[PDB]
């Protein structure tokens, strides 16, 4: 019984870590959209401040 429970422990940790890898992967694809949105907003704000400040 102990040895079977050990093999089940390994087989369960495997699927848990597979799901966690897939969830991290699906979370990168959101963090990167937020990142691009912030990059664009910063470029726009800086360049507008410069131009509309001059003259």
């Amino acid at each position: 019984g102990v040895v079977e429970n050990l093999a089940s422990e390994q087989a369960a940790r495997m699927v848990a870590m597979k799901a966690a890898t897939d969830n991290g992967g699906s979370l990168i694809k959101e963090l990167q959209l937020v990142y691009n949105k912030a990059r664009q907003a910063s470029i726009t704000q800086e360049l507008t401040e410069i131009v509309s400040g001059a003259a």
């Binding site: 848990a16 799901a19 966690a20 969830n23 979370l27 507008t48 400040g53």
Partner: protein, 458 residues
Amino acid sequence: TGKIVQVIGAVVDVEFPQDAVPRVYDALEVQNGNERLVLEVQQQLGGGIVRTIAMGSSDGLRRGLDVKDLEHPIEVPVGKATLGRIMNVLGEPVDMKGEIGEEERWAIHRAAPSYEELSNSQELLETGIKVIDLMAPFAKGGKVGLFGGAGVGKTVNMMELIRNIAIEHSGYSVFAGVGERTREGNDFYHEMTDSNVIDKVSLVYGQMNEPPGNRLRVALTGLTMAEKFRDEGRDVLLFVDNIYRYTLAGTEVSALLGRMPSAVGYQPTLAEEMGVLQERITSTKTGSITSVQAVYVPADDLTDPSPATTFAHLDATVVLSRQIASLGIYPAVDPLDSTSRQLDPLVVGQEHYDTARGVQSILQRYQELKDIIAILGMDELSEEDKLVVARARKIQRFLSQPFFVAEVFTGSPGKYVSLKDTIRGFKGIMEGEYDHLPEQAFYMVGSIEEAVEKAKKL
């Protein structure tokens, strides 16, 4: 006695004799085709020129037209005669009834009441809404603000508050629609007139179709009508449908007035324009104004200068969020951002205060786990922290409530929940006495009794 010399969008420049130049905020008059157009001067440029904002359609204006200087500021009907009728920014009647039999007219630009005259009130006001009067109770004579993005419930919540406090209230009421839909104004006018409460409400409407100047000064036009009832000794309710449009109209005009832009394109005078209004909407020793203000936040950015500078001017702030409304949880109040000056052990009692703070603590602890739950799944959470999550979710659902003004959407009948009845339900959910009941037992129910009853049907 003056000529037009420029017409840029909504702003008009007028040249007068050097010895007759109007004063700031005086009102001028022109003939735009068949119609008569009222201008309000904003600046005294040098050399007899004066720069103004048109309170109407600017199209059709030629150069060189002759404008007449009315020697007084914009003046609106005021008092008892303006009650149950709809008015322009200019104080003209906009329903098809006759004249407003006013005995007095007031200038819409006035100084705020002196610091000596102010008054403070701890008298709690009760509303039928669980989350508002648990997390952010507010008091008679105080300011309330509903912050939220586009389409999250900050108009439906204001109509529910009107229903719950305004009909059960003796004094008059004033409703200023600043830059919102004309459809909603018609719907509200007819709902009032069909329940015979219209003869207690004064309406002012400068809705989104109208050019910038009307949206710019309609809020002041409403505050004047409110100030009158206040100074008469009465106590008033003032509902402003969207105060963000008052500053958006300033931003639209600022650059034409020749003023260097500021932080995110906003006018350089944003904070002063906003203070000079919100400082005169207050209660005083001679009367009190109770005000609910919807505050749109652009692009859901709670750090944009316009909401950021408005936060300081409100006593109880209720912050709605799209991430909750997308869960079907209405009202979508965000309990970790709503607050109130009135949430103190002294004002609301130790039991209410402690329940509110416990709810905040639980929900925040649930927020802190949301990322580990996202990556590693919920089965990795300690048994103590799996109870916290289930109680947090039950609390999330129990803050939802059906509204009488939302039957049109959900069909379910509304509910009115007394404060005594809600702090008890949350004490119960937190202490665990309902910790054997499925979550969906708490979705859209009035009181804890109704939840234990709904659980029988699943």
